[PDB]
Amino acid sequence: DIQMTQSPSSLSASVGDRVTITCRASQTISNTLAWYQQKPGKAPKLLIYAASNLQSGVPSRFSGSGSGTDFTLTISSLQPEDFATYYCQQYLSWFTFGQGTKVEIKRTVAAPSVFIFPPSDEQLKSGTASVVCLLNNFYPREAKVQWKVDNALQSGNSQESVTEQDSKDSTYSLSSTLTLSKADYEKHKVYACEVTHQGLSSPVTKSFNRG
Amino acid sequence: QVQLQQSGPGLVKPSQTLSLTCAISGDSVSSQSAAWNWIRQSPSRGLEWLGRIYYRSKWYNDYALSVKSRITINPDTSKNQFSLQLNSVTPEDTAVYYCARGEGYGREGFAIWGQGTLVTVSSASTKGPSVFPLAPSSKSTSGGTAALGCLVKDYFPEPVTVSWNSGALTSGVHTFPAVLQSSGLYSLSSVVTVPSSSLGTQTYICNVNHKPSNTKVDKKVEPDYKDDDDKGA
């Protein structure tokens, strides 16, 4: 069988940069290579076939080169919408794929806009309280979210989720959800979300008082 | 143009059979200038071609060695579809499954893909989500931006889809990846930021659809107890 290996596994580049990603076949495949672009929650999209032929409907900033065992995909001028995982695939034999290269956009620092949401009265009726902290449209990805309940730092009772990089502004958003029983929730007054991020001069706290 | 529409259950019990269908529009399953494929994607399998069917005055199949003993891909010339059957599934079979067209035999890449079907191999039962509003404080709107959302909690299996105002509102929407809770049920939130000035002229509704349980919930999200149909205090 044929092994396809991509390098690097991931990269970060600025808008307008020339980006090159490589794909190595374990044996010669001549020109029997395709490149795909895959955006979050979507099927892979064919960009190049026969190593260097541009697929219909794909922008000319994408180009493929190479032959034999060593292939390259070049994006001449990286655009924010080009955030994706790119895959190569051989079709000399039984359609094997490379492991993908994740391309992320490097941009200027952007502080998150922070919002805190109390649990709904409807959820409280059911016996549980979910408290949500939203960090909206920030860059870079690295952020620290700490929960405080009546000024006591919380541990092990929250879960975070982060969006994939935005296709227009190249930012991330993050949710942190603090889950408590209704009884634990009603035993306390002040619910606070403390956010640390490079774009903030000091940590930002959003809070509410129960009731 | 050619379109591929996938269907079939996204939950299969361990040891049982996964069954999916790919419906073709704009081409024929029996085309002598195409081949019809199934390809899956997961952290354990990466992108993995599973097999193909194609007609050249006779039906032909090819299956990947990894699944050859358990797979069947059959054409339906009445419905213009092709199926995927994978027997005796295990948790290693949990993946997003795609159908795809290859011009000719596939020697020019796979140009047309279906939307994908997430198939989860689990003994757990389907459960529809509870949907709660994420209503911001009146104070948090003073900066010109209001963040609103919906918490989509305690469902199984993935996925859920969330739209806003029946798909009319897309700008500023962020639907987060789901997290698996200690209960073994998923939870996610979907948020949108809008101008604060719109909170009293525009209505915001999240439309949640969990296809495995046929659950559809449309939750209005606004910040006034005065006008409530059901009064308290």
Side-chain angles (χ1 to χ4, degrees), chain A residues 7 52 54-55 68 96 103 127 138 179 194 204:
Chain A
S7 300
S52 54
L54 181 71
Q55 186 57 27
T96 61
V103 170
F138 61 90
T179 303
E194 181 207 74
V204 161

Side-chain angles (χ1 to χ4, degrees), chain B residues 8-20 41 89-97 117-126 155-159 180 184 186 210 212:
Chain B
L11 181 59
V12 183
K13 291 183 182 300
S15 90
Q16 301 195 343
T17 300
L18 161 65
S19 189
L20 298 177
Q41 184 174 31
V89 300
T90 81
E92 285 309 310
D93 298 307
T94 292
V96 172
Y97 286 77
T117 303
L118 172 63
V119 184
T120 296
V121 176
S122 177
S123 59
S125 297
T126 304
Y155 62 95
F156 191 85
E158 285 206 80
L180 184 61
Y186 293 94
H210 181 240

Side-chain angles (χ1 to χ4, degrees), chain B residues 24 27-36 53-57 59 80 101-104:
Chain B
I24 303 157
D27 203 354
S28 170
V29 69
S30 57
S31 169
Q32 304 219 200
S33 59
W36 303 100
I53 55 150
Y54 61 96
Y55 184 84
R56 300 292 189 273
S57 299
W59 285 101
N80 202 34
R101 189 188 183 275
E103 179 68 32

